[PDB]
Amino acid sequence: AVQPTKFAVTVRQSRNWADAKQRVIAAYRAWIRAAPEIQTMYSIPFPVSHIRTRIRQEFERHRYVNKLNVVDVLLQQSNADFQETMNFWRQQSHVMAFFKELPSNFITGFLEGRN
Amino acid sequence: YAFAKGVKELRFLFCQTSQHSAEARSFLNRAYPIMKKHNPTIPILLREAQGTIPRVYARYEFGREKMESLEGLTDKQIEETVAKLVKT
Amino acid sequence: GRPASAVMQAPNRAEVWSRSQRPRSEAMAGPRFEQTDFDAQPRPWAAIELIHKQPVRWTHDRIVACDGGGGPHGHPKIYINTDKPEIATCNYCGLPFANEHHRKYLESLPQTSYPLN
Amino acid sequence: QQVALLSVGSAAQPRVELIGEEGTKALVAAEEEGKEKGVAKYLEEKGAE
Amino acid sequence: ALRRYPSGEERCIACKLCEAVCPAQAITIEAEERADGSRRTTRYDIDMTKCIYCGFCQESCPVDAIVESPNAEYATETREELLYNKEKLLANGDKWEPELAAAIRADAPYR
Amino acid sequence: PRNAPDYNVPIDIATSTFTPVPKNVQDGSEENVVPAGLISGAPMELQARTVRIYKPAKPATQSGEKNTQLWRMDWDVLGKGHRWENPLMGWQSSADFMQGTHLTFKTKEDAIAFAEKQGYEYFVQEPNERHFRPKAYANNFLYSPGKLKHIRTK
Amino acid sequence: AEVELTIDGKKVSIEAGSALIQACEKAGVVVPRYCYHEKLAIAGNCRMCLVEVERSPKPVASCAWPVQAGMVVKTNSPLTHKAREGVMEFLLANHPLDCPICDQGGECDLQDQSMRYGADRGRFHEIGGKRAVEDKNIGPLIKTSMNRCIHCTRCVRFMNDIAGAPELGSTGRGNDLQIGTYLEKNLDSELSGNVIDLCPVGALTSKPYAFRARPWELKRTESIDVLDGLGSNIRVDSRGLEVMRILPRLNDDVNEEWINDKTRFACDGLKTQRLTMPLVRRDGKFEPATWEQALTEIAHAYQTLAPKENEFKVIAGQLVEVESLVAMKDLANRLGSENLALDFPGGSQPLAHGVDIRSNYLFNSKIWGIEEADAILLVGTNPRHEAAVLNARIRKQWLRSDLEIAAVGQPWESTFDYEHLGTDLAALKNALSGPFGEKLKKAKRPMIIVGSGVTEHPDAKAFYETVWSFVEKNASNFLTEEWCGYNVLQRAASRAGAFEVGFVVPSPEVAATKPKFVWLLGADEFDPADVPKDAFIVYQGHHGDRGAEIADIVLPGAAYTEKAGTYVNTEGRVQMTRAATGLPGAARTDWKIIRAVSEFLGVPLPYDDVAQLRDRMAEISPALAAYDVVEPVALRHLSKVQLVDQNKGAKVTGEPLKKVVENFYFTDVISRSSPTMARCSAAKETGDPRTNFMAPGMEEDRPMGQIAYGA
Amino acid sequence: EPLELTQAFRNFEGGSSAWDQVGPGIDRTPDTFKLPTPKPE
Numbered sequence A: 001a002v003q004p005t006k007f008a009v010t011v012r013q014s015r016n017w018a019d020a021k022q023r024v025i026a027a028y029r030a031w032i033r034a035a036p037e038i039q040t041m042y043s044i045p046f047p048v049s050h051i052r053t054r055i056r057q058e059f060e061r062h063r064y065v066n067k068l069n070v071v072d073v074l075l076q077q078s079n080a081d082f083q084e085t086m087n088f089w090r091q092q093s094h095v096m097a098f099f100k101e102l103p104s105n106f107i108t109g110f111l112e113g114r115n
Numbered sequence B: 001y002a003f004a005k006g007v008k009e010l011r012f013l014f015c016q017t018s019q020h021s022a023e024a025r026s027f028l029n030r031a032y033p034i035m036k037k038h039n040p041t042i043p044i045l046l047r048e049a050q051g052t053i054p055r056v057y058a059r060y061e062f063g064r065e066k067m068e069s070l071e072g073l074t075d076k077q078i079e080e081t082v083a084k085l086v087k088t
Numbered sequence C: 001g002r003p004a005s006a007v008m009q010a011p012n013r014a015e016v017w018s019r020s021q022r023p024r025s026e027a028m029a030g031p032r033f034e035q036t037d038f039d040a041q042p043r044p045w046a047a048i049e050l051i052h053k054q055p056v057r058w059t060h061d062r063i064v065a066c067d068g069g070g071g072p073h074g075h076p077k078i079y080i081n082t083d084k085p086e087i088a089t090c091n092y093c094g095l096p097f098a099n100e101h102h103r104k105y106l107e108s109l110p111q112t113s114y115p116l117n
Numbered sequence D: 001q002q003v004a005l006l007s008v009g010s011a012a013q014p015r016v017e018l019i020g021e022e023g024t025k026a027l028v029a030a031e032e033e034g035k036e037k038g039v040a041k042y043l044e045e046k047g048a049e
Numbered sequence E: 001a002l003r004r005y006p007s008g009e010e011r012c013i014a015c016k017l018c019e020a021v022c023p024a025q026a027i028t029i030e031a032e033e034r035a036d037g038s039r040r041t042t043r044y045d046i047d048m049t050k051c052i053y054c055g056f057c058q059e060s061c062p063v064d065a066i067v068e069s070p071n072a073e074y075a076t077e078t079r080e081e082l083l084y085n086k087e088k089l090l091a092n093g094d095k096w097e098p099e100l101a102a103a104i105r106a107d108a109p110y111r
Numbered sequence F: 001p002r003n004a005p006d007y008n009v010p011i012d013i014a015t016s017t018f019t020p021v022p023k024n025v026q027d028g029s030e031e032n033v034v035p036a037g038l039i040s041g042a043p044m045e046l047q048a049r050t051v052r053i054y055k056p057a058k059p060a061t062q063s064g065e066k067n068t069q070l071w072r073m074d075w076d077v078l079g080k081g082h083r084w085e086n087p088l089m090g091w092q093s094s095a096d097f098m099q100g101t102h103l104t105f106k107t108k109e110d111a112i113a114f115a116e117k118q119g120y121e122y123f124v125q126e127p128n129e130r131h132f133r134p135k136a137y138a139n140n141f142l143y144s145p146g147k148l149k150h151i152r153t154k
Numbered sequence G: 001a002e003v004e005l006t007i008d009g010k011k012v013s014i015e016a017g018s019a020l021i022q023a024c025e026k027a028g029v030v031v032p033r034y035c036y037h038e039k040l041a042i043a044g045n046c047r048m049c050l051v052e053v054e055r056s057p058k059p060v061a062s063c064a065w066p067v068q069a070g071m072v073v074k075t076n077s078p079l080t081h082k083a084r085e086g087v088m089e090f091l092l093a094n095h096p097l098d099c100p101i102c103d104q105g106g107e108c109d110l111q112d113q114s115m116r117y118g119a120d121r122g123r124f125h126e127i128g129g130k131r132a133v134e135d136k137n138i139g140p141l142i143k144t145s146m147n148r149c150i151h152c153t154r155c156v157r158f159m160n161d162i163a164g165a166p167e168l169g170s171t172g173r174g175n176d177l178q179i180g181t182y183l184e185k186n187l188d189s190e191l192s193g194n195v196i197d198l199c200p201v202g203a204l205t206s207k208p209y210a211f212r213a214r215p216w217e218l219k220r221t222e223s224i225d226v227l228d229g230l231g232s233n234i235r236v237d238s239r240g241l242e243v244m245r246i247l248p249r250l251n252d253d254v255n256e257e258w259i260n261d262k263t264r265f266a267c268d269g270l271k272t273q274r275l276t277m278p279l280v281r282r283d284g285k286f287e288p289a290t291w292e293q294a295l296t297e298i299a300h301a302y303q304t305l306a307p308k309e310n311e312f313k314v315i316a317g318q319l320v321e322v323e324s325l326v327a328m329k330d331l332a333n334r335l336g337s338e339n340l341a342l343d344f345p346g347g348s349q350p351l352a353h354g355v356d357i358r359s360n361y362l363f364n365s366k367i368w369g370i371e372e373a374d375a376i377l378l379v380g381t382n383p384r385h386e387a388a389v390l391n392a393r394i395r396k397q398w399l400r401s402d403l404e405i406a407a408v409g410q411p412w413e414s415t416f417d418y419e420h421l422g423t424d425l426a427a428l429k430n431a432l433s434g435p436f437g438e439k440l441k442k443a444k445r446p447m448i449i450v451g452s453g454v455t456e457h458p459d460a461k462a463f464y465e466t467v468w469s470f471v472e473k474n475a476s477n478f479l480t481e482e483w484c485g486y487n488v489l490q491r492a493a494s495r496a497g498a499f500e501v502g503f504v505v506p507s508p509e510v511a512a513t514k515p516k517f518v519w520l521l522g523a524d525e526f527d528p529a530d531v532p533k534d535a536f537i538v539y540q541g542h543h544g545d546r547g548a549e550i551a552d553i554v555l556p557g558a559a560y561t562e563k564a565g566t567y568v569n570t571e572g573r574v575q576m577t578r579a580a581t582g583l584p585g586a587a588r589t590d591w592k593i594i595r596a597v598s599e600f601l602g603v604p605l606p607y608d609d610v611a612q613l614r615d616r617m618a619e620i621s622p623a624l625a626a627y628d629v630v631e632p633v634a635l636r637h638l639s640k641v642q643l644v645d646q647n648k649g650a651k652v653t654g655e656p657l658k659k660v661v662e663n664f665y666f667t668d669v670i671s672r673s674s675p676t677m678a679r680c681s682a683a684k685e686t687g688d689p690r691t692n693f694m695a696p697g698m699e700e701d702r703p704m705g706q707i708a709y710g711a
Numbered sequence H: 001e002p003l004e005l006t007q008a009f010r011n012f013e014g015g016s017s018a019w020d021q022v023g024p025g026i027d028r029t030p031d032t033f034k035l036p037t038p039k040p041e
């Protein structure tokens, strides 16, 4: 067959919640380990602290998931997004599209038009 | 025996069905005539809809409002339940 | 909107011919028209003026056929009743027809829509 | 209704006669037995033949 | 190009068939009854940067109004020059009518 | 707190000045519902927007009834951004990316299940049913012992 | 009983005396039709519904064949294929080749059933040509193109039976039979535009709609009509920014596939005199304002005036929805006001019927109840100009049954027959004491209908006690286990919903307190005495009309084709609109405007979203959360208190009942701004049957035509 | 950026036929895969 690429990971299902628990930590660790390496690959002018902050928030939005089959789709997406980033397939515009650098009240929203 | 000065409207939410006991309809059947005669200037809005837990609202001055459920109350217990609302 | 080539709706007609037609003077204005040759702009002739210079095709038959005269090149063949004392018009091309039974009435009207002759 | 086609045959090659009435009640059973037990179960009890 | 009858009347009657069949939604048409009660377009736009030049619009015309000219040399300096309104399309027919007629004459029996 | 606009909902690359404030979004803790809208990739605007689930009524202009057969799911028009006129040609612009989309379902339940799983807000209207009544051609000619209430004309 | 037949091999049951075509719609079997309509009499003319039936030498018209005990019917046999192909050949032989110039294209039964049931090619090529007939003038609304007619008779049956307008007919004979009026005369019926939709083909089309749209480019929105009190179910057809036409849609409980002309043809007033920006009156001129500098200018005025209890006054108009009244009731209540008026005359004082029991102010026997009605008394209402499609239902029940109608009030030209009993309360008192009261007493399903004009009258106090006293005297006829003889008819969409939540002046003590800050919530027909000259006037609405032009500040709100607002119709049905388009310019949603100003005035309202306000709505009356349905009044007999006990000593004046609708075409801001209604009124004033009366088109006296429509 | 369109997509799907144009078709199953029919008497 054709060779899987450098960070290609075989798609496998989580055995139990302990499996998923350990994989999510492995994925979060691997992301924040790579933040210094992302910065010089993509010439990020922000410091690495901001990059790791964004990694933390992406993981935090899936914090309250209690379904193995939703976590494994999520562990799939991060694996592909990690592989995509580390092999430098995406470019600076894609990585900067990921950093964003709604009205806070009804009355603020009303006065400007909806938002 | 009219209401206390300050009650701006009464609002009963009950249902036609026996799903909830007939006591609110029994109290309103008897109360609403005399409880409207003694003070005609106040709206006692009788509003009903299928599967509505019995309940009563008193709206007071400057927009304030008090709610109390009528669920499980009897035609007498419901009477004092409204009575504390319009007596002060 | 200095020249007449930027005001007149068409070379053959000055005013608009539809309810919703934006006047030329209201559409040749703005920054997009500040270094522009107005007479070089597309300014086609109004068909509403042209069709009404056609003279009436007189006929004795109750019902006339119009296919646009082009054979397959024209338009779908239709039939126009000529019974009202009024010039009957083809709905596709606007050509005017009248019935000779109204020749005396139409040649009495103070004005008309198409040249009777 | 593959178990059914195995039970009683087909308009081309019927298995048993199904003559008149009392054959219809067998006809529904062939469909009913298919809906209650499938092909693997059908081959299990009839055996290997 | 938009074409006219031998009398100078527009052939277009606003049926909207070409707007419907377009595979690229490059045609926008608005119609009304004209001052004389005629069914005529008020808007007629072709986005020449959306068009795919398939000819489906001239295929569907009931009255041979919309045609594609034999002209290919009309390259422009800006894309606004490629947004044709009814004023530009009638002007195209008014200029190109002798070929448009000779092409239809030569190609009509096969249609 | 009783269906409240949450003003701390995070924004993503797809939020514009026409995105509604959301009452709630899926997070994957909800019971028995697959949180598809959390993992679908659609923006959060899809969970701040209510859909309409209904069977289209027969058009007044025709007697055919094939477009009444199924259940349709559409996206409601918002107050701003649905249409505005382009300054150049007068074409009608838009900022609503759901305006040209609709889904079709076999039953009402399927539409609810899909909207629940996608995180849509959703409103259902029920179809108005025809009231049956026998129609007899012979009613056209019934005898009248007294005053004719109208003169039938066929 | 339901007899049993087999259609296309499948078994179907249906009541005997049904048409065989009817048994087909029950059996899910499609049968082609042109002349047959479910809402009309069977005509038998088209021959497109011929099917095969056993023991039958020739094909039978399925529309006109009575279902027999055990028939076997084939709708898909070689006999039916041969008949449908042959009848299509006949209907298409003198039909004009005008599918490109016709407004029925893409929505045509003749092309859809020609494509499905006819041959692909015509065999008609005669050198003699096709039949051509001349066009006709039947008023300013219905453009004629009569070559297209297929002689189905749907419009003549509708005009004569449904609408009571016996001017349309079919003169002639043979292939020269022609639908039209003999004399060139206008069609005078408020249900007129319904023949446009009934017309299978585009011979009878809409003048305002002509050539503007095609059906495939139209977005379809299922909404509610707000131009009267019935809440007719409509389909709103939009092409982007603009509404194009208003169609009826089926609701047998409400409108029965019909809408009136004002509901239909006033949509062109949704684009003409709109409010898009806040205007502050400065030095006698209206200048544009930012929303902030308009709400601040409002807040400053309120702070300066310091209105005590009930010097804040709110008047609500015909088109206001319940999300606004419930939001405005909560704003005024926290400002210290209970002064919540209504736009009609007498809308700023306590009403003769109260609002405690819903049965006081509803159409309690349903609109569907007229389907059974045996005796109907009318009290001060013209059912034609108030509820035009409800007026038709009365006629329908009258033609097919022994229904007796009498009325009290101003005589009106009617589509049904009735007895005029008088014009005032003395006449009504004799009416009930006399033969019609005994007719009302003796009948099953008796029906008294009070119009909202009575509630506007000097003697509504006395009228409403007189009627209810008759009802209470005559229960077990009027107040049975399944019947309610008492009805109040509303002619405005906002008014039953206003009653539903108490948006009404509670006492004359409130009504006697002169306000200094008046909000006109969509109010434009307000009496000049209900608005102080020195009060600070705020107008909220969508049209620049009588209300906006006397105000100090105007706030642009939404119209009903651009909001999702709840409306309660005259019988207490709770319905919601659906926005067909977005908001114009800088207009806002009305309940958001009211919520926005509650910030500036110092008392913000708890809700920030429509769901939070609809939760508020459902605990004012929980029926407002049950959409599309009518809740039954549990304590029905409690209606005696406000109707009789509260209305006993009334200074009766004897003034006769009035005609509250002077001009049907002009009843609200949208209608008064419609060019199409302006032509309807002007043609009706002079009788010009001409189609291009104030419209584009050539005429004999207009050789060159005109671009102007409505002038 | 969030998607704005100078001209919004025009969905002409609402122009679909109000009448069903294809019908049910035909059955073409061979007799060898149909159940038997009980012959009379």
Ligand SMILES: *P(=O)(O)OCC(C)(C)[C@H](O)C(=O)NCCC(=O)NCCSC(=O)CCCCCCCCCCCCC
Pocket (backbone or CB within 6 Å): A021, A024, A025, A031, A038, A054, A055, A058, A059, A060, A062, A063, A064, A065, A071, A074, A075, A077, A078, A081, A085, A095, A098
């Ligand atoms: P502790 O017991 O608190 O354990 C914490 C965790 C997070 C494990 C939770 O308790 C937990 O089990 N929750 C459910 C699992 C979860 O949080 N999510 C599933 C993991 S996949 C995921 O979250 C993917 C996030 C997005 C992709 C990775 C982030 C990086 C994105 C790109 C960064 C920058 C690139 C340019």
Ligand code: SF4
Pocket (backbone or CB within 6 Å): E011, E012, E013, E014, E015, E016, E017, E018, E019, E029, E060, E061, E062, E063, E065, E066
């Ligand atoms: S198809 Fe041809 S005639 Fe019809 S609207 Fe389009 S251009 Fe005009």
Ligand code: SF4
Pocket (backbone or CB within 6 Å): E018, E021, E022, E023, E024, E025, E026, E027, E046, E050, E051, E052, E053, E054, E055, E056, E057, E058
């Ligand atoms: S040729 Fe161009 S304009 Fe005509 S249909 Fe094709 S893409 Fe549209």
Ligand code: SF4
Pocket (backbone or CB within 6 Å): G095, G096, G097, G098, G099, G100, G102, G103, G104, G105, G106, G108, G110, G111, G148, G200, G201, G202, G203
């Ligand atoms: S009614 Fe109009 S669209 Fe239908 S077939 Fe006739 S001409 Fe064509």
Ligand code: SF4
Pocket (backbone or CB within 6 Å): G148, G149, G150, G151, G152, G153, G154, G155, G156, G179, G198, G199, G200, G201, G203, G204
């Ligand atoms: S005008 Fe229309 S409805 Fe009337 S007979 Fe002709 S086709 Fe039928």
Ligand code: FES
Pocket (backbone or CB within 6 Å): G032, G033, G034, G035, G036, G043, G044, G045, G046, G047, G048, G049, G050, G061, G062, G063, G064
């Ligand atoms: S539908 Fe039965 S004949 Fe016209």
Ligand SMILES: [Zn+2]
Pocket (backbone or CB within 6 Å): C066, C067, C068, C075, C090, C091, C092, C093, C094, C095
């Ligand atoms: Zn012609």
